Amino acid sequence: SIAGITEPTILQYFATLNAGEFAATAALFAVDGVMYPPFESGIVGPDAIAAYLQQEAQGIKAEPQQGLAETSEDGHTQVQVSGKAQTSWCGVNVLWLFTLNQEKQIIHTQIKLLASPQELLALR
Numbered sequence: 001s002i003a004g005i006t007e008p009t010i011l012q013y014f015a016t017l018n019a020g021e022f023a024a025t026a027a028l029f030a031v032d033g034v035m036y037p038p039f040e041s042g043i044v045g046p047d048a049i050a051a052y053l054q055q056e057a058q059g060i061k062a063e064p065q066q067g068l069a070e071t072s073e074d075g076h077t078q079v080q081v082s083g084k085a086q087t088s089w090c091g092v093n094v095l096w097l098f099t100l101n102q103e104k105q106i107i108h109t110q111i112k113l114l115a116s117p118q119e120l121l122a123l124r
Contacts, residue, residue, distance in 0.1 A: 002081060005067035009104045010079050014064050017057065026050035030105040038113045039124040060085050064096065075102050090118045 001011060009028055016024040026046035029035070034042045035049050043052050067081035077100040085094045093114035099107045113119050 002064045002083075003066040005064075005069060005079065005081060007069060007077065007079055007100070009100055009106065010067070010081065010098060013098070013106070013109075014062055014081075017053065017062055020054075022054040022057070023050045025053055028106050029109075030101060030103075030107055033106050034108045036108065036110040038111055039122060059087055061087070062094070076100060076107065077104075090121075092116065092119050 005011070013025060013028055023046070026049040029046055029049060031045060034044050035052065036042050037052065043049050062083065062085050064081045064083040066083070067079060070078045072078055079098040079100070081096040081098070083094055085092050095112040095114060097110040097112065101107050
């Protein structure tokens, strides 16, 4: 769970991610949902998304600490979550920005790294 956030979709995003259930994580997105990761351009659809997560977020532990949520006037739920994404040898501070549709699918996710020198030695 995350401080300030009780939205089930977001809890599952991080739950499944930390179990290596990458296609389950990716299932949370609408079929044309987009992930915007730190170093590449956008990735479209659960398959490209699940590929990305499995062959990148390998060996990573996402550590969501706190979050905010809003409803925009078009009925979408906006959820911002801050935390860390660590490994054993290095980590990074992270802002996760989610937007959900009325059906609770992820329409898009942006992952922003809050920059440092360890981040500059990324594989990407």
